[PDB]
Amino acid sequence: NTVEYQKNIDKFVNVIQGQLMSVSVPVNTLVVDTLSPTSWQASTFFVRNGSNPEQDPLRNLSGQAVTRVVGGMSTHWTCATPRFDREQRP
Amino acid sequence: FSYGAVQQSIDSRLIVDWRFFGRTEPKEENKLWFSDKITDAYNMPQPTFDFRFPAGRTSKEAEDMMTDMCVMSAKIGGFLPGSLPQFMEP
Amino acid sequence: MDIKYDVVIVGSGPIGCTYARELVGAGYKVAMFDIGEIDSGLKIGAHKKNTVEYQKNIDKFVNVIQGQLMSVSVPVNTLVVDTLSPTSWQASTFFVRNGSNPEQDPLRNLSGQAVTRVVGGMSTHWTCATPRFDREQRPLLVKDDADADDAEWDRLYTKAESYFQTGTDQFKESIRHNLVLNKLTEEYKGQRDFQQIPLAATRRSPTFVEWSSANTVFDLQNRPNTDAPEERFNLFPAVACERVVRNALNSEIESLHIHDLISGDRFEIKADVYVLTAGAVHNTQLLVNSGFGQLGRPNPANPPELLPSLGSYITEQSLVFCQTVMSTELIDSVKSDMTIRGTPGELTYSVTYTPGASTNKHPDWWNEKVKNHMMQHQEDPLPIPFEDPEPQVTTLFQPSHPWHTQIGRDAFSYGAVQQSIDSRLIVDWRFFGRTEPKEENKLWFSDKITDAYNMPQPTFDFRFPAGRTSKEAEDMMTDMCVMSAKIGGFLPGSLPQFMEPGLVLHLGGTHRMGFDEKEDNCCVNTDSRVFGFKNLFLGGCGNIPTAYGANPTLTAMSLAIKSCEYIKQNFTPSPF
Amino acid sequence: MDIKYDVVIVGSGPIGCTYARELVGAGYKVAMFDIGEIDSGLKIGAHKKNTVEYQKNIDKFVNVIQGQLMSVSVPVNTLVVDTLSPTSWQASTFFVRNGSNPEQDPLRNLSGQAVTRVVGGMSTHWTCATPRFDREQRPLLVKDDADADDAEWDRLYTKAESYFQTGTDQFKESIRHNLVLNKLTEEYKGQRDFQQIPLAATRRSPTFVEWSSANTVFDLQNRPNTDAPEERFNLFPAVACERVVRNALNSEIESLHIHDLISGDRFEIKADVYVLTAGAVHNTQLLVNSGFGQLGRPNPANPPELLPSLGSYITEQSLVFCQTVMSTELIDSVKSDMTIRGTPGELTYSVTYTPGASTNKHPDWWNEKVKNHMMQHQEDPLPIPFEDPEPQVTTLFQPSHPWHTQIGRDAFSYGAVQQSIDSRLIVDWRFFGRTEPKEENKLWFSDKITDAYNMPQPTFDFRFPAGRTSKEAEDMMTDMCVMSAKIGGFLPGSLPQFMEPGLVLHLGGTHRMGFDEKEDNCCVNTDSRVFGFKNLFLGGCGNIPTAYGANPTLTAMSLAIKSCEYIKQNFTPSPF
């Protein structure tokens, strides 16, 4: 709800991304084998960069994230508010 | 909440997005749990997921849902290269 | 090299080779020239995928295809690179760089169109799918008599299928192939028919297929030789054919002008009969360089003298593509006859079936393969044997689904190939649309710009026609989405998409056939003879004047067979 | 195929072919087997880049290279794909998929190592750089007499250069080549020397180079033939050589076991002399499959019986790469002798020079080329002619810069090629480091896992050594940054980087040479004879036991020449 974001709405994705903090990131196993020989080089895929060694990467909700700001996720959300029909509703 | 570098090539007036959202059967085995050793950024038990989309109706519906988006979106225009039909990160 | 031949053939692709097979066989003294060189091994013009190594590493063959597809027309590049160092030489304009074609509008191109200049042409790398066209896609050879027209095509297609060794059962023993084929049959029960793609190929073993090519049609060995002591054939590679010379009457060709690329020398060659099978693009180039049609940017106020339809009414097919990952239901079905006891990896583990058990869903051969894989590779989570061949499935074009389809695993992959997902789970989907011929869709050649061989540069002016062509193309995409979903979800990175215009390499109608030059807007008659000329014949997919979706080569060959009938009936071979 | 030959050679690459040239020539009855097939045209084993089409489209040749580099050892993939549809079959583990090697640690691999199985081996696609090694990079052939050692290498290298037709002036008439060469000479005045890369090649015209290959060394035609009526040679492609058979003494080989890949049959072949030139990887594979060294994961507590250094002390070079965009100063220098009057595109426009003018910075030939380009292409903003050949520049390895360098434009590009920036402005930079031999750096072969030819799967255990190897590699990167800057800024998308370990394909020391098996930790003597064996010889870069930075093939050939001296002095050819 700023005049600037509604004149440049293509930029708002960046606001959303900057307050979605991933819930559970598995241990990374990407091979980087083009480091210079002088650089410190891992022998294992050890727990690095806030990854969660408990998480199976194949049984995750990798895209799950949280927002810690006053107003929560409603400071960035799409504002769609449908009712549930009987079939979806407790 | 765009999911890729946004297109500049094609006029924005021509672009329409399609998001279809499936329902997921509740199953006991699909879990959110918290580590007794690992902690998050606020020194609280680290969240860990053990999740797969259920077999059966959840999965059949999800794939029928993809097909439905293909069929319906075609009534309005062809896919935008770089935003082809896809499932998003769980 | 002689002065004088009975017949000269320009190009050694499978269509050139149809002409050689027929005319060498009928006793003519034949010379064939190709701009490209012999580079397929000792079998000249053969398929490059017929090595033991490529069939053990088929994922690498895409690189062979890419290394001999040379783009037809590349527009001027306008990409901004603004991170050069300040010291580097930096353009002020987007000037004509790197062999781009300044005549080409980037928005009306067939960017994916490419050519192959090697002995055997494109048949040294092609997929080998050879469907017949049904009536709806096919030009008439007989007017006003459909059963007679049908009979003639059946005669010609039967012969063409023998020359190519087309068959429909080389993949019958593949689990994956049958898995897919049977699922689709069952889902479209009473609506559509599925079968193996007709493939020009002979299986040599469970792990090796001898894919057909130009060599299969005609082995391209110089004659006479021991096997053919009364035949006369010479193949001259690395010779660029530049021009056919018209007499003043425009009733006969008098010579073929050639440039020997090794010596640099230019010559002329005399023959009774001239046959141009240089490809849909390069036939048209040679003709335009010879005074047929119009050179340069089209100018409707300056009408061409000869063959005014040349280069117009061009067609190229729309192509949609995706891959899928086999469904869990389908995979579990492969092993539905197995009784499993114990835990894989253990001494007690047992996978069994009964050979003949009435309630078995699969043949014993299939259950044997599955049992053995599962017991011999108890670390592998899939029931499909490692060397199981790929599916080769189609539902052929029909009025209700007016596209051709090829479902399986094509060597010509379009992205870095996936290593993450097991290859046994992957199935490719290609659906091919038909394109209405329209006068305004053109291939033309620059009067100023030249290509790598110093010939007039090819330029496209093409858009998919509005109307049925476009409606069908988009219905075709939807159809692939709907059908592919019956087998499994899309493979991330191979999502449904249209391919670059012309990547498909099914260009037609650049020198099209018809009964009457004026009424049918065409260049050659149903014997493939150029109107007005006694002794000039065109062969190839440029001859096809209709909107077709199936792969055109078998059709083009069938037309060349008919052309060769005319030649044999109208020209006498020299004495030996 | 006969029962019995004088000499059998395993592999048809340029090292196999050195053995054939020497021994066929000396009158031996020779059989040569290759696992791969003839696929280079009628000149068997020749360079695939010697077609008119590839030299008109050299940007496409990378695809030919890629299509015959088959990775040696691919670790198990662990990429997460979590956007599959819920219906697709989805793995629970990262299981052994798609021909990966479960023995391979992904963090101690030569991931870029690959092999080529075609007649002529890697010499059908290689760059053709053939530098000599200076003393610092080179194994001793004479102990305790440096001038004598120098003399012997010079004798052998001179011969090897003739077999390959090495020269240093094929690019002397290139503006770009000279532009670069001269600038570097001037900037490192009195510090370093620059020259043309020595290249195994003969220029045939201003636009065509006949690149050397195995065919150049030996034409690979079966003999006797008309040209060589008293020679005896047979080449058997599509034959996998599996094992050499040792006698019980471990003093002689008694047969070579082979698998004919077309028939599927296995045979044995008897010869007086056995030569293995299968490549640095596959020589070691064949040996290990024959009871030399140790099969399986290394086990220092179970010492091998024979050749305990086999597969250890392996070396592979570090490789750094970038491209640049020619500086504005350099480009303007090309045309510094021209007087320009008027505006390009106009009737008055004039570019002139004086042919001999004392103050001219360039030779008349150069100024003629530049004047003509500028007047004939007044729409082009550059002074460099379109068909100007690429630079081919080096400063060879010296103690003060202990790397080899190649500056110009290599066919083996490493990314989608740029179309945006004019190709005339682009120069590539490759700097090649030397790697200390260390016992712990290993190539070994699985006792369980097999490759595509049912042979023990190759597995690497490699890291660049700490110490000098690593310090030098990083100084080498810095050196490329510093030197390349003298010519122009980096090309976006080709920024300075180390390449994937082993992409360089300069693997050495897998069956290394020395004077004494124990003291020098080696497998073959300075005649390339396997210790203890009367009639088994190894050829190839696996023989090289030192840390070298220059391209190894000419060195390996020089060693094979010396090996063939021994063979000629110690074995009598059968009667004809």
Ligand SMILES: *Cc1cc2c(cc1C)Nc1c([nH]c(=O)[nH]c1=O)N2C[C@H](O)[C@H](O)[C@H](O)COP(=O)(O)OP(=O)(O)OC[C@H]1O[C@@H](n2cnc3c(N)ncnc32)[C@H](O)[C@@H]1O
């Ligand atoms: C991010 C996002 C979210 C939604 C949409 C799209 C985008 C990209 N679109 C959308 C949504 N929902 C709809 O119904 N329709 C739409 O079109 N989005 C989801 C929606 O945004 C959420 O469902 C909604 O906010 C949930 O409300 P809530 O239950 O109030 O929860 P919040 O996460 O918003 O706020 C919680 C709040 O608590 C704080 N916090 C977290 N942990 C603690 C602890 N330990 N102590 C104290 N406070 C805590 C957070 O900081 C947060 O502010």
Ligand SMILES: *Cc1cc2c(cc1C)Nc1c([nH]c(=O)[nH]c1=O)N2C[C@H](O)[C@H](O)[C@H](O)COP(=O)(O)OP(=O)(O)OC[C@H]1O[C@@H](n2cnc3c(N)ncnc32)[C@H](O)[C@@H]1O
């Ligand atoms: C590349 C490709 C092509 C096909 C398939 C897939 C791939 C990736 N798959 C395929 C095809 N067609 C089918 O029916 N089904 C399949 O599954 N492909 C198309 C097919 O490959 C072509 O339709 C067929 O070869 C055409 O045959 P042709 O008319 O004989 O033409 P070619 O292009 O093969 O050969 C022409 C020949 O002429 C030479 N040439 C060109 N210009 C000149 C000049 N001026 N002088 C002398 N010679 C010339 C070429 O060098 C070439 O060899």
Ligand SMILES: *Cc1cc2c(cc1C)Nc1c([nH]c(=O)[nH]c1=O)N2C[C@H](O)[C@H](O)[C@H](O)COP(=O)(O)OP(=O)(O)OC[C@H]1O[C@@H](n2cnc3c(N)ncnc32)[C@H](O)[C@@H]1O
């Ligand atoms: C691919 C590559 C290679 C080189 C350059 C660049 C490119 C991209 N550039 C280059 C090289 N070397 C130089 O000195 N300077 C250059 O500028 N390249 C390396 C060079 O290409 C190799 O060093 C050289 O060929 C090695 O020669 P060789 O020892 O003869 O080995 P090859 O690998 O060429 O040939 C071996 C041969 O044996 C066959 N084979 C393999 N295993 C078997 C079995 N079991 N039985 C039978 N035959 C077997 C292969 O098929 C192969 O043909």
Ligand SMILES: OC[C@H]1O[C@H](O)[C@H](F)[C@@H](O)[C@H]1O
């Ligand atoms: O990708 C282009 C190719 O796709 C498939 O292999 C077809 F069979 C070919 O005919 C060609 O269209």
Ligand SMILES: OC[C@H]1O[C@H](O)[C@H](F)[C@@H](O)[C@H]1O
């Ligand atoms: O990229 C790998 C290649 O780079 C260059 O062409 C070298 F000359 C080759 O020897 C090889 O190392």
